Amino acid sequence: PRAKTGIVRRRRHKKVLKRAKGFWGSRSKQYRNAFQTLLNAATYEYRDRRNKKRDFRRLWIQRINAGARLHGMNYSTFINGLKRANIDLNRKVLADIAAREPEAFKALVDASRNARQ
Amino acid sequence: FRNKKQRKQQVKLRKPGFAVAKYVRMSPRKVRLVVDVIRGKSVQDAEDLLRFIPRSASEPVAKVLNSAKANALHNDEMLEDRLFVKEAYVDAGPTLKRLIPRARGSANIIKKRTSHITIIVAEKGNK
Amino acid sequence: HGKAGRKLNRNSSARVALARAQATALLREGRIQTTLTKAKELRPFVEQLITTAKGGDLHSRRLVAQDIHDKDVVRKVMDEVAPKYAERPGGYTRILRVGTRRGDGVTMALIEL
Amino acid sequence: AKHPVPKKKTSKSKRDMRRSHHALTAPNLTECPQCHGKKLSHHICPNCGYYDGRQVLA
RNA sequence: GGUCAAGAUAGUAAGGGUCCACGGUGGAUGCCCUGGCGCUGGAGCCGAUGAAGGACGCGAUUACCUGCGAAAAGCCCCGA
RNA sequence: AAAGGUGAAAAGAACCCCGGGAGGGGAGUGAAAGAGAACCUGAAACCGUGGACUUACAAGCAGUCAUGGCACCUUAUGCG
RNA sequence: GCGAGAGCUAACUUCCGUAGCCGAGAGGGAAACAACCCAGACCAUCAGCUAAGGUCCCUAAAUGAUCGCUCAGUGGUUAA
RNA sequence: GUAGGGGAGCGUUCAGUCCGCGGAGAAGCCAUACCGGAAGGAGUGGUGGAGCCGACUGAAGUGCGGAUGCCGGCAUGAGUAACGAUAAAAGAAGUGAGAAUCUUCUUCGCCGUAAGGACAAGGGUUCCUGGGGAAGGGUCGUCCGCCCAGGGAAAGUCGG
Numbered sequence A: 001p002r003a004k005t006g007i008v009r010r011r012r013h014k015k016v017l018k019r020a021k022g023f024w025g026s027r028s029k030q031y032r033n034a035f036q037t038l039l040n041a042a043t044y045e046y047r048d049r050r051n052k053k054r055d056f057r058r059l060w061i062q063r064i065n066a067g068a069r070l071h072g073m074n075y076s077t078f079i080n081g082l083k084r085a086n087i088d089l090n091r092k093v094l095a096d097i098a099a100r101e102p103e104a105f106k107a108l109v110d111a112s113r114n115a116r117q
Numbered sequence B: 001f002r003n004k005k006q007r008k009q010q011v012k013l014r015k016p017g018f019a020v021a022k023y024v025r026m027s028p029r030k031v032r033l034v035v036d037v038i039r040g041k042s043v044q045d046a047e048d049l050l051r052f053i054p055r056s057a058s059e060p061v062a063k064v065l066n067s068a069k070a071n072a073l074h075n076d077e078m079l080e081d082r083l084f085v086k087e088a089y090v091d092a093g094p095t096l097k098r099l100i101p102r103a104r105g106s107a108n109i110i111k112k113r114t115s116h117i118t119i120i121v122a123e124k125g126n127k
Numbered sequence C: 001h002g003k004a005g006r007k008l009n010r011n012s013s014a015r016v017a018l019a020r021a022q023a024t025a026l027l028r029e030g031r032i033q034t035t036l037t038k039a040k041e042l043r044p045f046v047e048q049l050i051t052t053a054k055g056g057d058l059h060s061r062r063l064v065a066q067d068i069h070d071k072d073v074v075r076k077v078m079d080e081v082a083p084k085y086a087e088r089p090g091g092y093t094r095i096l097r098v099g100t101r102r103g104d105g106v107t108m109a110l111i112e113l
Numbered sequence D: 001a002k003h004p005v006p007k008k009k010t011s012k013s014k015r016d017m018r019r020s021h022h023a024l025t026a027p028n029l030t031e032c033p034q035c036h037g038k039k040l041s042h043h044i045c046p047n048c049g050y051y052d053g054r055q056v057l058a
Numbered sequence E: 001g002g003u004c005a006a007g008a009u010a011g012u013a014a015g016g017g018u019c020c021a022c023g024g025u026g027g028a029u030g031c032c033c034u035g036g037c038g039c040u041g042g043a044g045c046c047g048a049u050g051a052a053g054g055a056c057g058c059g060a061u062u063a064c065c066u067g068c069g070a071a072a073a074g075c076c077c078c079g080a
Numbered sequence F: 001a002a003a004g005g006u007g008a009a010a011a012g013a014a015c016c017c018c019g020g021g022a023g024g025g026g027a028g029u030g031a032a033a034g035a036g037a038a039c040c041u042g043a044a045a046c047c048g049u050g051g052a053c054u055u056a057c058a059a060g061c062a063g064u065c066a067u068g069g070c071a072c073c074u075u076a077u078g079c080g
Numbered sequence G: 001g002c003g004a005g006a007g008c009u010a011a012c013u014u015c016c017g018u019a020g021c022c023g024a025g026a027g028g029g030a031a032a033c034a035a036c037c038c039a040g041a042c043c044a045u046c047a048g049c050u051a052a053g054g055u056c057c058c059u060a061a062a063u064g065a066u067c068g069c070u071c072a073g074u075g076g077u078u079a080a
Numbered sequence H: 001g002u003a004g005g006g007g008a009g010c011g012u013u014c015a016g017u018c019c020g021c022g023g024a025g026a027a028g029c030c031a032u033a034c035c036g037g038a039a040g041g042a043g044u045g046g047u048g049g050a051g052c053c054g055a056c057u058g059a060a061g062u063g064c065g066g067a068u069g070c071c072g073g074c075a076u077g078a079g080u081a082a083c084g085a086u087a088a089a090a091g092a093a094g095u096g097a098g099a100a101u102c103u104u105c106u107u108c109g110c111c112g113u114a115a116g117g118a119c120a121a122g123g124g125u126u127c128c129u130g131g132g133g134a135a136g137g138g139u140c141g142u143c144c145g146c147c148c149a150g151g152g153a154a155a156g157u158c159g160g
C-alpha cells in the first residue's frame, strides 16, 4: 500500500506557525522562516531562564547599596555587618525592606554598624 | 435556535445594499485608486465624483454603485436621501495569463488581472 | 535654462502645417473643438491672420493666401470676417474649456471667433 | 545578463510605504448655477452646456 | 481665577506594524467513482473470397465520436 | 501534456430591479441556493476591507527575558 | 606552551616530539574574539557561597586601608 | 556532545479482530488559555454533508526546509521598461450604451524602378454580404485578416 503525507505535514506546520505570534513579517507567516526563528528563540529561552536569576540579584544589590548609602554605609560594608552579626541572615527579602520599610531598614543598618566597628 | 439544518430553513440570508461587479477586466490596484475616493461618501457625492475622476475604472465602479443603489431601494425598501457608501473594496478575480515574445528567443507572461468590485450602501442616520 | 517664448511638439514643417490647418478650420467653421494646448497655440496665429486681412488691399489678401491655401476661406476672411471686425481692437478669439476625453484623457477646448 | 537587478524581495511593508503618495485627489466639484448638475471650475457645465449663457448643445 | 517666566507631559498617522473579524484568490486535504495496475485462469493467429490500418462518404438538421458502406446510424433469415 | 465532482431528482431559477453586456440583488424551486451551472470539501502562499493596541530623535538575525501601560474574558478572572 | 629541525632564533609558516584546549564544549573573564584564563550545562526557583577576573560613571561590587614611586597622560607604540 | 553504536517510544495508509459512533451531523478544514517527559493527544465551538474513531495484532510507496530538486499556484522588481522605424496630421459631419482610434467629406504629409500593378511558390476561405463584439488586436474599438451564418470559385483553345 501507498501512504502519502496528507494531513500530517499541515498539522506539523500549523503547530510551529502558531508559536509565531507577534513575529514580524515572514517570521509569523511562512513556515520555514517561522520555524527557523524558533531555533534561535530556543537558545534565548534556555539562557534567559538562568539569566533572570543574575539579572534580579543585580537589581536587588543595587537597591541595597542605595539605601545602605542613605544611612552613610554601602552594600560591601552593610552585608559584612549582617554577616558579622551571624544572627542576621536575611539575604533574600533584604531589598524590599530598603524600598518599602525605611524604619526597619535603618534598624538593620544600625545592627550592621555594630557587628563591624 | 434549534440546529444548523433548521436555521437554513428558518433564516434565509439577505445582502442589504450589496452589489458586486465580478470578473471585471481591469487590474485591482488600478481599480482600488478610484474606489478609494468613494468610500464613506454620500451615494450622491459618489455618483458625482465618479463622473469627473479621469480614470477608466470610473465607469465599472459607477455601474456597481448604481446597482447597489437600486438594490437598496427596490429589493430592500430603504430610503434614498439617507444612503451612503458604508463599504467598498476591490478583490482580485482570476488572472488571464498571456505569452509575449521577447528578444533573442525568450518568452514572458503578461498577467491580465481581473476585478471583483463590490460596494455596500447603507442608510446614514445621525441618530 | 530655456527663457525663449514660442512652443512646437513636432518638426518645423509640421508646426506650420497644424497652425495653418486649424487656422483655415476656425476661419471656415467659426468654432472648432480641439486640445487645450493646441487651441492656445492657435489663438495668436489666427488673431494675427485677421489683422493682415484688415488691410483690404491686394497685398493684404495675397499675404493671407500664404497661410490660408483655401480659395474660399481667403474670400470669407477678406470680404466677410475682417470687415465685420472693423472696430474691434483685436481680440476675436475666445477659448472655453469643455472637459477631459476618454482615450488619452486630454482636456478638450473650444475655440470660436 | 540583465545588469543592475534587485538584491532581495521588497517586503509588504516597504512596498506599501512607497505607495503613501499614490492616492488620487478627488475633483473639487462645484454645482451649476443653472441645470443643477455638478461641474468643474473653469469648465462648461456638462449637463446644460452653459458658461453664463449656453455654449454647447445640450 | 489673569499676564509673564521656568519645567514637564499629552494628543496628530501620510503611511507602517502585531493581533482579531469578515472576504477574494488558489486548489492542498477529506469523501467519492465514471479510470488504471498487478496476479490467477481462460482463450490465441488474420489475409488475393482482398487483411492489419486508413482515405472519402452515409443523418430532416451533423462539426466530433460511434455504427455502417452508394442497399451506406443500416437490408434479409433464424432463434431469444 | 493537463484536465474529475450542481442536486436525491433539472424541480437548470418564469417574473421583477441596476447595467449595452458581463455581473449581481430579489422572487420562486429544493432539506440546504451556507448546492446556481467559473456548481462537493475549499488548506497555505498571496491580495484586500473593517476593528483593537500602536508607531514620525531612530542604528536594526528582528527574537528572548523582565517590568509598566492599554484592551479583552467560551479549556479563561488571578488566570491569564 | 615546552623540546628540536627546516626558514631570516620571519610568518596566523612548515615538519616532528610532548602536555592541554577547539574539533565535538555551552556558562564567567579577556571591549569584540574556536584555541588563552577560570570552569565541564539532567530539569525547575524573583534563594546562598565562590573561580578567573574585578569594585569612579557607562557596569555588579571599597571613589578601601598603610608606607612608598612617577608628573610623562608615562600608564594607554620597539631598539641601538 | 559531532561521526557512530545501543535502548524506549509518537505518528500516517492499508489489513485481520473486537468495541463502538454517525444526516438530532462522519471525515476534512478553521479557532483555542487543556493534557502528556517528547514525538504528540483530548475537550469545546465554528464550517462541512456521508462516512468514521478507539484497542490489539500484522504489513508498508510510513514522517521533508534544504537537493541551482519536480509539478502547481502566487509574490518582488512596479504601476516601473516598453507599446516594434521620426512618412505627419487637422477639422467638420455621421454612427453608437460608449468614439483620438469606426464611416463619410474637405485639406495636409510619405512612396511612386514603389511603399503601385501582374504572376509563381507557399498559405487555406483569410474573398464578398449580413451580423457579432468574450478572447486575439501591444491603447481603444461601434472595427478587423478575429467570431457566427449564407454566398462566391464556371475553360475544346490559358497551366498541367
Ligand SMILES: CC[C@H]1OC(=O)[C@H](C)[C@@H](OC(=O)N2CCC[C@@H]2c2cccnc2)[C@H](C)[C@@H](O[C@@H]2O[C@H](C)C[C@H](N(C)C)[C@H]2O)[C@](C)(OC)C[C@@H](C)C(=O)[C@H](C)[C@H]2NC(=O)O[C@@]21C
Pocket (backbone or CB within 6 Å): D001
Ligand atoms: C552581449 C550579451 C552577452 O555577454 C557578453 O557577450 C559579454 C561581452 C561577455 O563578455 C565576455 O565574454 N568578455 C570576454 C573578455 C571581454 C568581455 C568582458 C568580460 C568581463 C566584463 N565585460 C566584458 C560576458 C560578460 C561573459 O561573461 C564574462 O565571462 C568571462 C569568461 C568572465 C567574466 N567574469 C570575470 C566577470 C564574465 O563577465 C559571458 C561568458 O558571455 C559571453 C557571460 C555569460 C553569462 C553569458 O553567456 C551571457 C548569457 C551572454 N551571452 C548572451 O547572449 O548574452 C550575454 C550576457
Ligand SMILES: [Mg+2]
Pocket (backbone or CB within 6 Å): none
Ligand atoms: Mg634588547
Ligand SMILES: [Mg+2]
Pocket (backbone or CB within 6 Å): H065
Ligand atoms: Mg523547498
